[PDB]
Amino acid sequence: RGPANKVRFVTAASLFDGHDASINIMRRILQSQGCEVIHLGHNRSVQEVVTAALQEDVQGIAISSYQGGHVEYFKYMIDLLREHGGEHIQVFGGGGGVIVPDEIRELQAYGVARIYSPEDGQRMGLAGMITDMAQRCDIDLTRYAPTTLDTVVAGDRRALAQLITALENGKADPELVSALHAQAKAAAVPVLGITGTGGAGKSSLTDELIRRFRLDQDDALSIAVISIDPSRRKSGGALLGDRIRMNAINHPNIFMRSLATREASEISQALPDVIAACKAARFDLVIVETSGIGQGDAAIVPHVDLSLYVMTPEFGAASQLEKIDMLDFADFVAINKFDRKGAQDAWRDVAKQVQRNREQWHSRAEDMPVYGTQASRFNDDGVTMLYQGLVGALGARGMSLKPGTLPNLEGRISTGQNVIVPPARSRYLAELADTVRAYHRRVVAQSKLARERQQLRAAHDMLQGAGHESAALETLASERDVSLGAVERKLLAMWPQMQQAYSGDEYVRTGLISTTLSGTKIRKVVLPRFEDEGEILKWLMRENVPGSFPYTAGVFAFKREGEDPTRMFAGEGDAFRTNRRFKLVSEGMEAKRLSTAFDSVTLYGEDPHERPDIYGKVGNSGVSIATLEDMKVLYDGFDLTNPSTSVSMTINGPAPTILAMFMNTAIDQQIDRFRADNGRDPTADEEAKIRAWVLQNVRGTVQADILKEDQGQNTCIFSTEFSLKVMGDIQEYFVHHQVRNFYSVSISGYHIAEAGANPISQLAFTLANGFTYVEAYLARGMHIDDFAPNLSFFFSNGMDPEYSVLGRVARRIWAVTMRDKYGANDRSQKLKYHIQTSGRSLHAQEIDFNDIRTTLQALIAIYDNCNSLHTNAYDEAITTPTAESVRRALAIQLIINREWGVAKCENPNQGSFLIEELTDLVEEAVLQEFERIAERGGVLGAMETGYQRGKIQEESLYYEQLKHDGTLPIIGVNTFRNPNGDPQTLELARSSEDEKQSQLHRLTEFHGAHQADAEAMLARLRQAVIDNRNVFAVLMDAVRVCSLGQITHALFEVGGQYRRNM
Amino acid sequence: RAYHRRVVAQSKLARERQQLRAAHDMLQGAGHESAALETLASERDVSLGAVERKLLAMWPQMQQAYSGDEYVVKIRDKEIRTGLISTTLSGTKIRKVVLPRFEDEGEILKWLMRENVPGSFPYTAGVFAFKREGDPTRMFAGEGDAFRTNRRFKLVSE
Amino acid sequence: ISGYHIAEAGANPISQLAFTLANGFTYVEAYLARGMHIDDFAPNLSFFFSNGMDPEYSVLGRVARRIWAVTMRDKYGANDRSQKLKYHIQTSGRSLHAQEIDFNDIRTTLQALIAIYDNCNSLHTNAYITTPTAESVRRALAIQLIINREWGVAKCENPNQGSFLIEELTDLVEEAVLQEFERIAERGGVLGAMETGYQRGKIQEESLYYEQLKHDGTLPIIGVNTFRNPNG
């Protein structure tokens, strides 16, 4: 048995917070214990969460806040709840080590029920927390329900929400119920039913339709939304996952309640009561979404005034439509996901079927209420067409509405002709798998030939040394000279010459020898001493020396002389403070390698504001950058156009906007440098030469990997498709201006890993995402050798064995595929990547132990010849690195690179039986995962089903189940605890109050400066999206007169918002 | 230095021996039957030492041992089974002792003589077959008179 | 037979390993010349080495094992138990410094790692100056626990084997040790060399050379001669 009452929760992550890994495994335990969970997903303001909890009438709220600003956040929520009749709703929180003990006691004293620390998780266990959390919220909310309809009819939306909880639980008085239906009948409001197959897009299409209603009627309509999702009878509760897709329901005139079927039927047993309740609440329209219905299911029809059947082009044979009961009753049919293959033919089958069912032979098949929609697409003309149709039908059915402001267009089918990856190339990942496996098959065969060839000629020389000469052997040998390929033959031929190269003290110049205190010569690159030419060729093909195909041991011959791979992530407070931290890290280093971390506000493209939702997060967890002037200040004193200076900005959603700021900054620096070296402004021609030169030589990297946002980090603000569109615009801009030093995208999986994915999943997903971009650009008309060298990677290094060979595997898979499959050049076959030590592998308990783990992870990174390395501080679980903390992190790299003896060799991994076996295993495991994604429609197709997110969250749970368990030993956490129990007072990296006020004053000053050109520039930006030009090209001008928030919100009106994917 | 000189010489012999018999099998597969090769091969069977010959002979049997999930070896009248596999969170089988995948019997013998598996001469990779599981941290104590040092001994070792 | 002090005094890994094996073989010859049997005292012989940052330390243990096993078998004709050299490795104390004491846990980790990789029989870990506090000894004890229990590569018991670097280093260090044997032999054996103070002299020579390059800025020591504390 589950809880005593019908226990409901609202779960979400705090505002501008992408950390869902924590909250996701909580709503899973909640659901399994028998709770209905209305999951809102990541990035939710207080105003959002409270509104939801109030409309759903829940007993509890669970929020995860890892960005900081949690004190202000929860206080706001507690205040807002009490103010709007939700004092009895309990609030639970968690942020791991971010929420220090003092802040927990403060928040719990303020009103928060419980906030769970990592130490609480260890003591109570995963299920223990949720049990405690659920047992608290096990209360009957029907006592708060109104006894008369006076409140509800008046317009009280909170009373309505509570009346529904009474009606649903059947604790409403019979005389009240009949009185409700009596007024519901006289109410005469239209009830739109939206049903269809599972995952067809019912929720997404509903949200879009509501958006249409708002834009068309200037938000004058009062709409009630009743979404029903199927309930697992085993647990008792359900995962009501419809509200998470709704982005247009955030408005006082919109009300939404999530119902569980509670019958493992497609409608709640009290649905007619709930509908009637909304009708009596004087709503202009009631919309009802059902759960996944079968072919012969149509229970929504008798409860609504209009019914809409939603389907996808994938329905099998055309004869299947004769079995679908809903096609016989539906007033409107929407074929959503019209981007899928065979959408047009699907429409012609459905159209003809509806024509047959209505016996309208005297009508055209194209005139039937069958619409081809694409809800995923922003401002889809298809959806608008369906909307126009619904309006005409709702109008005749007594519903006053003003003459619309929307494009009253004609047609039944969407005209969205955009494609990221053509259906012809759908199985691209599978082909890549074949390519790699095919390469290895050749290595085996060519080795056997090279081996046999040597064995023969060896025996021939031994026979002649004894007397008996047999030319019969030579015939078989010469036979295998031709059997060997041209490339393979030259490999073995250059082998003795190759050995003589790496033998001496120099490489004709580069030194090969570093001598120890003992007087031992440590060769930078150690060559094998095989006699078998089979082993030589096998080695040369599978793992050649660093700087030779397939670049397994590194893409470069020898490691950089002065520029170490070190690149420390940094960001705190305003641009002024971070500019200090940059100078701290890069102090005493000729090569300035910066890595910038932005605050949660900037990461979501928002300007700093006074509201406690946002204000408390400004300057925390990263530098607050809102204007070009902030960006300039951030890198002041750093010559961005200097060859030995590279800047790595970690930004995803607003990445194009931030990149435009950086580019403008690098340009303006050289304009200032010229104005100083000449004492005059450069002419229009001089400036044009300077501006163009900057773009070509500017060295750095912008993350921007949107594919990983949907899957891992959740920093996607615009719609996925729009983000990918603009990301391409950036790469096109780079090509035109010959930006050959900047990396347009750091294809990452670190985030995917930190979410919980094991090294195999991380590596596979990341390479898959990378290959997706390749296919995307290839289908977009760019030469493979034009964008491939601009592709950067990012990985995580944890404690798992596979991490030791993660980099070398990624290099080989890339090199082989780029050569054989895509036929690209050498620069393209070379995969360069950044490795950051695993942050989740570090804990809040016994923080001194983390330096041990971060050392081991940093070691295998350097051993495997990484291109760039970040080291995590010991206080990783609690705060952004302190001045003392970042030095310990920076010392780990310095000690390994300078002091550590084995490190004096640049290929110590090579030869190792374990490394070579692990390399082969991990590689094949990755290839198999490629095939799993390929049979799900590619990366995009898998994302459509939430395959990656599902697999990540599953592995996250599996790990976490073991961490608390004890099966997976974690020193200082689940074993070898402290007899004292010390996790004292540690220094924390929060932002100064003055710094917050500074950013606000700087912003309003910047705004006042370009107040004239502001609206005009933003208008140009939206026209760039409408006319479908290059967005980034406009951003290069936009960031000069517009703030980060202004640009983001302008793009929202034309590029839409990200639809969360659970 | 004398030992290593032998490793070089015995490897060359083991290598040549394989190369000959390999060529002999390839000639017979084409039709030509030249036993002149076999004479040079059998000549190197004697050239190889007794110990070296047995090393290569036990190599395929050695591989089958470290291949499975367990290590069966019967001492006295009973037996002592030991696990070879530790599985990662990803589901990867990490073998306790990883054997080389050489085809050249020259490299096999060279490896077996210079660096045999842990628990085999010359014990380069360790004197024991597999590491002990589980505590081995000694309890050091020594201060003041014999009474104080004793108490600490008794206290730590409680 | 210990070599902890010999290295700690300043001797590089080659000198340490060579002198220690030489001392060990001296005991063997000493006991043999009392008319004793080799299989009676050889299994009782224990060894004790230092693991520093130098490259040679990565293969110090495996070299000692092979040199012992080969000589005990071929030269002295002893049994299997005698050919097996068991040793304790303690992380270098000299390699840890008073400046920036938090850095020492990094060095002690790396040294503990190659010890375990090379399949040592017993390992001591050094704490991060002051008295051996119960907190400081826990950080030292955690280094071993983390590597043995959490670290992934450690799940394999011969990760060194196969490595081109390891096998080349093993051969080099071995021969370097053998050459040092010959230097001691032409000085009258270990006892004869001690008579001239050869070992002491050579240890002292290397201790000075190290201490020189350290001050010279030539041998980088993080937190000591480079990347020094900007506050203290």
Ligand code: B12
């Ligand atoms: C994984 C992780 C990420 C992943 C997130 C993946 C995902 N999809 O969630 C990635 C790599 C994407 C990431 C990114 C960022 N992160 Co981060 N991340 C972490 C990390 C390593 C662990 C957090 C985690 O998920 N832990 C797993 C959970 C399950 O365990 P736990 O935290 O110990 O929680 C326990 C209890 O507290 C309890 N509990 C916790 N929450 C809840 C909730 C409920 C309802 C209940 C009942 C219980 C409960 O359950 C657990 C039981 O053991 C932490 C550091 C750390 N190790 O603590 C940094 C950390 C949280 N991140 C940090 C930052 C700054 C960021 C970035 C903003 C960096 C940047 N500037 O770009 C980005 C962007 C985030 C975004 N997109 O908005 C900082 C926070 C600094 C601060 N707030 O002062 C941290 C502390 C790292 C650091 N030291 O700098 N992050």
Ligand SMILES: CC(C)C(=O)SCCNC(=O)CCNC(=O)[C@H](O)C(C)(C)COP(=O)(O)OP(=O)(O)OC[C@H]1O[C@@H](n2cnc3c(N)ncnc32)[C@H](O)[C@@H]1OP(=O)(O)O
């Ligand atoms: C919120 C959290 C979770 C995060 O997401 S934190 C994210 C942190 N991310 C990062 O720090 C990403 C960092 N990565 C990068 O900057 C890039 O991916 C990068 C490729 C590693 C950049 O490395 P760089 O030091 O700039 O080296 P490169 O760009 O390759 O070198 C420039 C040129 O120098 C030359 N070069 C560089 N290195 C060498 C070597 N070793 N040999 C020879 N020549 C060399 C060469 O000519 C290079 O250009 P090509 O002719 O095109 O080959």
Ligand SMILES: Nc1nc2c(ncn2[C@@H]2O[C@H](COP(=O)(O)OP(=O)(O)O)[C@@H](O)[C@H]2O)c(=O)[nH]1
């Ligand atoms: N390819 C494509 N995917 C869509 C479209 N509309 C919605 N989706 C996706 O389909 C998934 C499920 O959507 P959802 O609204 O929850 O469907 P529901 O469960 O039936 O209500 C999500 O990943 C949506 O992004 C579309 O027009 N095309």
Ligand SMILES: C[C@H]1O[C@@H](n2cnc3c(N)ncnc32)[C@H](O)[C@@H]1O
């Ligand atoms: C998400 C991961 O990024 C790193 N990280 C996050 N924020 C910062 C910051 N301000 N400074 C340095 N590193 C940071 C940590 O290692 C964390 O685990």
Ligand SMILES: [Mg+2]
């Ligand atoms: Mg839905």
Ligand SMILES: [Mg+2]
């Ligand atoms: Mg639904």
